[PDB]
Amino acid sequence: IRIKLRGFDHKTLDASAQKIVEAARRSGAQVSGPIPLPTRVRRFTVIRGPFKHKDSREHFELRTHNRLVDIINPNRKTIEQLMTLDLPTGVEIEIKT
């Protein structure tokens, strides 16, 4: 009973990692606190000008962060509770066995 969450901004990710943990800490028991997996980063280097000025570039990153959380004891009061929660738009969720 495992969930992994993914997003381009931590402060959304870190937020819905909590509000998941606690919900099964509401209908317990064992909830394995949110691990911070390593951040996978995708960069873009770009000629700053539209033409010919090659030694002037500007950088850009795109970070997907990664939080994993484990609930050891199902309690079908949370395999119910969770389905209706508050997961904002910046995040994606996968659920495991």
Binding site: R6, G7, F8, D9, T64, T89, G90, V91, E92
Partner: protein, 206 residues
């Protein structure tokens, strides 16, 4: 030509994106087109309302466009019927369930993107450029702002020699990241070329 985009410079600090979602490598881009195509329609159709910020939220197989219009009377139309014929027009591009809010404007004289369009239209309508800039910057500071800067560039008055004209009041610290600078751009077509209009409103810091 030197200075960096004031908004691009404060994403993650003073400014939020205009699209919020995650998508995997396999179709981040496809979404991106819809978004750009979306604002295409709305900035096209809802210019007359005075459009200021299209906020596009995504979760999965649906969408929530939030339009920030100065006169929401034009958006919703005669009895939830305009906003409908467009919420229907959006499905024909989106395909997905296109959920469309209309959000009020705080004070239009504090929307840098608005000011820009108001000035660009005045220069589009043959008004004195220098005057229109001093007037615009007055109306902002009166609306309780902490600084304002408007910049016109092009064949002002139709002058063959292109020129830069600007006016600034209060304070505008573009090097300060805790400063909250609403930036906006408007383009103004004329019989003799095009003019760019940049409007800077300083809304206070954090």
């Amino acid at each position: 030509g030197n200075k960096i985009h004031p908004i691009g410079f404060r994403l993650g600090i003073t400014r939020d994106w205009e699209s919020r979602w995650y998508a995997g490598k396999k179709q981040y881009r496809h979404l991106l087109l819809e978004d750009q195509r979306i604002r295409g329609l709305l900035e096209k159709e809802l210019y007359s309302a005075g459009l200021a910020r299209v906020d596009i939220e995504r979760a999965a197989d649906n969408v929530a466009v939030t339009v920030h219009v100065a006169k929401p009377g034009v958006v919703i139309g005669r009895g939830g019927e305009r906003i409908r014929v467009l919420r229907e027009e959006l499905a024909k591009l989106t395909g997905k369930n296109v959920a469309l809010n209309v959000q009020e404007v705080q004070n239009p004289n504090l929307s840098a993107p608005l000011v820009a369009q108001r000035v660009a239209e005045q220069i589009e309508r043959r008004f004195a450029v220098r005057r229109a800039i001093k007037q615009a910057v007055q109306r902002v500071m009166e609306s309780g702002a902490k600084g304002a800067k408007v910049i016109v560039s092009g064949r002002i008055g139709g002058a063959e020699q292109a020129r830069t004209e600007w006016a600034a009041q209060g304070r505008v610290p573009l090097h300060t990241l805790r400063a909250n600078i609403d930036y906006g751009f408007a383009l103004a077509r004329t019989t003799y070329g095009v003019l760019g209009v940049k409007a800077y409103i300083f809304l206070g810091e954090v």
